[PDB]
């Protein structure tokens with residue numbers, strides 16, 4: 001064989017255009033054609049996924065050029081594996097995007113469309129699941145169109161691929177959450193290294209961290225309710241998770257950002273972890289993010305009229321939910337009163353996000369996110 005594959009994820013420049021994508025595609029088609037390289041490029045919501053395959057040397061040279069490119073950043077290698085045969089034969093470099101992005105760019109082949117519509121807000125689908133699903137989908141589309149070019153492929157076909165991948169990971173993840181919840185319930189600080197290793201194994205990205213945390217959080221809320229653990233135990237666990245998070249994920253603020261956002265807790269609530277996660281998730285898709293733990297409504301009012309950052313995410317406290325709801329209500333309402341900013345947007349999580357959007361209108365908050373991992377998606381909608 002002697003064929004190799006390389007795949008990475010990167011953050012497209014915030015000012016990226018169709019002309020750029022097309023230039024990349026033409027350059028890449030030409031060069032890959034000469035150098036005997038194949039693969040696919042997937043663009044969705046400011047993010048690139050790419051797969052490249054060929055002889056080792058070719059892949060290495062082209063990666064040398066790509067890494068230094070200035071139309072994207074945070075290139076993270078995801079795989080460098082030997083393959084038995086090409087997954088994208090005939091595709092020197094084929095472009096593809098999500099259905100939503102197809103709408104946003106005004107496109108309608110030859111660009112392979114991926115319908116994420118049905119699975120995008122499914123919290124059981126982890127990051128690597130989406131990546132592998134995209135890979136398999138595109139490889140298959142490549143085969144198909146190699147056989148029957150004028151035979152169109154349904155975008156929403158991808159959904160099944162994604163769901164299938166997630167389902168493959170489900171059991172193992174359940175084990176992980178169980179083991180984890182046990183650790184957090186016993187001595188999370190005495191066994192922090194184990195917590196970290198688990199998290200590191202099962203949560204490659206920050207959103208994954210968020211999924212695991214939601215699961216553990218309901219487990220522990222149940223445990224605390226049934227008086228099986230103490231409040232002190234929950235505080236310990238919370239600390240342990242903050243430490244583990246910071247050790248593992250700690251993205252710098254993106255220099256070229258899609259926008260700026262303020263993440264704040266409600267005064268008295270200490271959503272330290274949830275705010276950190278929110279910041280990590282938003283940073284990972286290209287948002288400039290600031291975390292604030294204000295102690296008065298007025299403080300935040302000042303910071304907002306100073307920043308002129310028209311977007312505010314109120315991070316929920318998923319472990320102090322005795323009175324998160326009415327507190328958040330009062331807080332957002334108060335904030336809206338002391339504020340004179342027609343462009344201001346507010347997003348809310350927790351139990352408040354579980355209410356029907358009618359209540360959301362009534363709330364003065366603009367939109368909700370019933371699960372942490374849904375936050376990026378919820379933000380893009382308002383933008």
Ligand SMILES: Cc1cc2nc3c(=O)[nH]c(=O)nc-3n(C[C@H](O)[C@H](O)[C@H](O)COP(=O)(O)O)c2cc1C
Nearest residue numbers: 024027028031032048050062065066069071072093
């Ligand atoms: C997301 C992305 C994917 C790219 N993929 C390829 C590729 O598969 N093959 C290629 O030759 N260039 C690719 N490029 C372009 C290279 O980064 C770079 O423009 C080119 O290889 C060097 O230009 P040259 O034609 O003067 O050698 C890609 C660029 C970006 C931003």
